[PDB]
Amino acid sequence: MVVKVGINGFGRIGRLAFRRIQNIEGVEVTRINDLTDPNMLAHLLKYDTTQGRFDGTVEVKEGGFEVNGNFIKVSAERDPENIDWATDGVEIVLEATGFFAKKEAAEKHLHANGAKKVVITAPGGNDVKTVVFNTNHDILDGTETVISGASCTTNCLAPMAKALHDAFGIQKGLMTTIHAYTGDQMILDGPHRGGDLRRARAGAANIVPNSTGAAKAIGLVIPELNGKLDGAAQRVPVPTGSVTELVVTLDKNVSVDEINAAMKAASNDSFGYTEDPIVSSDIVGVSYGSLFDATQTKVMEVDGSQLVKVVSWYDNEMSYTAQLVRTLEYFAKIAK
Template identity: 50%
Template sequence: MEKDPAAIPWSETGAEYIVESTGVFTTTEKAQAHLKGGAKKVVISAPSADAPMFVMGVNNTSYKSDIPVVSNASCTTNCLAPLAKVMHDKYNMIEGLMTTIHSYTATQKTVDGPSGKDWRGGRAAAANIIPSSTGAAKAVGKVIPTLNGKLTGMAMRVPTQNVSVVDLTCRIEKGASYEDIKKAMKEASQGELKGILDYTEDDIVSADLCGHPASSIFDAKAGISLNDNFVKLVSWYDNEWGYSRRVLDLLSYMAKVDGAH
């Protein structure tokens, strides 16, 4: 197994588009090492500190063929961004706070142990609800520039293996009833965001969405509003399968754009 991406002879295999999913090479400088072996483009399947981030259905059309390394952002950003896009486009979001109730992941501990700077992150994943940080909400400001500085959030890591859920609480400038918001989400799910944003009025729980291909599944029955300008929205996502589908969609979109030049 080759650990140095620069030493992988991609040109010999015919591979042109590489998915960098080790979680190690997440900056442009590190990920572009794949290009030395003959790769043409690299998609980082994680957030990146400096690589351009693209979220399908939100800002993928800003991709240009001269960009060699891109990030598909995080699974949580892929869930939140379509939700935020609808709210901002329709009602002008003033500000918002997000919490993701997130299934545990491979970076967590199976039993209590040391965890460097994140003491709580060292507790047993399958036995605790663990407050954690996430850059997913702030990252939305990178893919929707008009929301930059208007969103932040946190995570709660919970003892489930898969499927997570976003809670977005926001203030909107243009007043709307919760019924109006439901209608807007449903229309978006059947229109410009079809396949990215889904809509349900079923009484679902997390296990029902394992294997769901959408980035974000708006739960119409779970949200609430305090008034026409302050609302809490709930949207689910399969943080493994749904995200993987978007990686492939981004690859396909990039190849289409690149092929046109």
């Protein structure tokens, strides 16, 4: 009754997903594929700048490493169609490299003696179901071969936008996420391999504007909001931890207290609520996908009409990963 999982890309999301999977019964990781040797991967699992020391033992072995005595095979195949996942019983692959985040590319894992299903740890295109756990995981039926866990920002934005929309009716909106720098930025100014003149700049030494598709693509998660939102990011020098601001007009006039109460009423394991005046370091490592912050709510009313601002925190690392593993765990129970 345990589904065997493989991780392609033992990066920030891959390693934290591995960490969370150590505390759930329904799945286990039997194989990791990356581009390096087992000693590099074992060391990066054991020691983690932002998420702390690993909870357990890690011992490098020939061809893999042992976690609390259990051997995990490590391979270094650059091409997914060359990974023989089935040899190690792997049925579902977490595709966490950032290089195969579309249906046709992720399908490369599904070859003979490969895997059966793929969860992309990122937006995966419009022909792949895009799931924010506890907002729209109802759309899965288990027959899908490739699904998407969406982005960090989408998992933050979606429960907040859904709750506000259901209560008051979102007409239109603009989003800004103030976001930690990530591994797709350069450590120091240099050529960006994706052509982005702003991610080319030193990520820990600048406020860096950058594009994000979370608001424009929200219809994959909340169909009623298709075509109603847009937004962007300001990437700033913290190594993890982020926040999403959303400014909207609504069908109903509201008060600050009414907004905050509507968010609290929607709170659950994915969507948290706080009235404490926290800062970004306080959400590093949290398990909420989105933490609504009532201290930042604003309503600007002039001449009987309002602009409404709502703000939610997210650890783009652990908040996203908690949501990803919730979706993986659910998908594994229904996969067919």
